[PDB]
Amino acid sequence: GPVCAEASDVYSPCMIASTPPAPFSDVTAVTFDLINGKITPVGDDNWNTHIYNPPIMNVLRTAAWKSGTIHVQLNVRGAGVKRADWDGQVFVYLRQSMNPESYDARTFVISQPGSAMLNFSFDIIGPNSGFEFAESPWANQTTWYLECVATNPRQIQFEVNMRFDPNFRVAGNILMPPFPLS
Amino acid sequence: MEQNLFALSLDDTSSVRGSLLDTKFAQTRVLLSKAMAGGDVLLDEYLYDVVNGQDFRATVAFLRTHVITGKIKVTATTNISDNSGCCLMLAINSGVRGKYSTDVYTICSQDSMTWNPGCKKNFSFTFNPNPCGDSWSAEMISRSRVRMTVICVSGWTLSPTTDVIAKLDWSIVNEKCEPTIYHLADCQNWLPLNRWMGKLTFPQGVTSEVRRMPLSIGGGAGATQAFLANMPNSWISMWRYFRGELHFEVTKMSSPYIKATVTFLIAFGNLSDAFGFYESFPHRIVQFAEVEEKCTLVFSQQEFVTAWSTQVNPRTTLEADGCPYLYAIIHDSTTGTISGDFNLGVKLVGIKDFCGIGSNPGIDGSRLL
């Protein structure tokens, strides 16, 4: 409808990735590790990735054990393309593993001209009294991946925003390397 | 003789338990070079790996018992004459992500011990290797990749004649393994932070040495073009403003011979150096006996008018910074009979009656040391 619902709590940008520059035009994709804060372009495509350092990412990258709900907003930009000529599609997948044997936990398809905005959420829950340790060998725990596929790199330029639900809990410290400034 | 083997008590799933002797499972050596310095890693391995090659009464029980409800106790034995002193820190971390920082700031945070061999004969500590549960196992710490390190926070005040070997003794105790879990309630009775506020080097002399350290503890520690962060601080940075009762642990990291009276008070960045009226502010006088090396500071909510920001933009000057700072002031003069600088370590233990306000959108820049 003409009237949209108003968002409330603050989301923070965390990860961005630009499709490869022209003359690139092949269908491509990029994977976001929503917990460890990693961006992995598919194949050798020249994706201009970048990661920020908000409280949320600082928590996700240092909290050993996690439990709770995470809200994710995916923004898709957003290039100077005449609407009538738009043919870019966005396919996104939530995954618990990048191994071929694992199936998608959730699929969304976005065919909006210009730009798009997708809201969804997922739960972090593991075997340690409800806590999960993102890819630890213990109990074969794994992280969460957000796979983004772009059918037209010249029309589509991705932004991941995140928010912790009040039920989100953490414990334990991970020794991270220094975090480079944006 | 025949016997119903099935009915035998061979399904004993109880945890390790008994005397200290029959609960020891491993011992290690930490080589302290007589010439070492701050930030100098002494030991860096996996917690699990501690058991390799060990032959103690509970080594087997530790490794085979698939569930333990007790805690891991670490006893450190090391001692050096009063002529010197240093600061050793032992810390337990849940895991790593390659080429990690070894700075005391990052290394501590979770579980740790800080002591000075020039004051203590030994030192001990218990911990819950499973920070969010009531039980754990050797297999768990192996596959979860639990780490432990020993690091020289402050170098020797006076170098030892020869290298020193500190010894660690690992055992299981019957203390109930209680969890430490962080959450987003905006009102909490106790929030553990273990933040390394800083290493205060006060050189010997008759100058007025003043040190400042912000209570705007979020954002991490400024390294270079990057910064250090640990879970407790990233958690506190979730809120925009906060307040509560502060509990600090002050550690004498220099030898007993290096002395200086230190004043602690909370004020603002408007106070300049060379201001002999600091004592006007409510303050605490900290002195240490040759035996002593640890003093707890308490700053109740009556020390603060309002809450204050978890982060500020690093370009903000002291004058322009309206958030409170903890001042460490040489009340008299730093001296001794030997050379060396009075290193004093300050750690924010935690917050009592914690109030968290709003929500921090976040600042990428840290705050600088």
Residue numbers in the entry:
A (entry chain A): 1 to 157, 159 to 183
B (entry chain B): 1 to 369
Original paper wording:
Cowpea mosaic virus (CPMV) is a plant-infecting member of the order Picornavirales, with a relatively simple, non-enveloped capsid that has been extensively studied. CPMV has an icosahedral capsid structure, which is ~30 nm in diameter and is formed from 60 copies each of a Large (L) and Small (S) coat protein. Crystallographic structures are available for three Comoviruses: CPMV, BPMV and red clover mottle virus. Together, the L and S subunits comprise three β-barrel domains (two from L, one from S) each of which contains a ‘jelly roll’ topology.
Until now there has been no individual structural analysis of CPMV-T and the RNA packaged into CPMV-M has not been visualised. Here we show high resolution cryo-EM structures of CPMV-M and CPMV-T to 3.9 Å and 4.2 Å respectively. The cryo-EM structures are of sufficient resolution to visualise the individual amino acid side chains and both structures reveal differences between the CPMV particles. The resolution of the map permits the side chains of the large amino acids to be visualised. EM density for S subunit residues 184 to 189 inclusive were not visible; these residues were removed from the model.
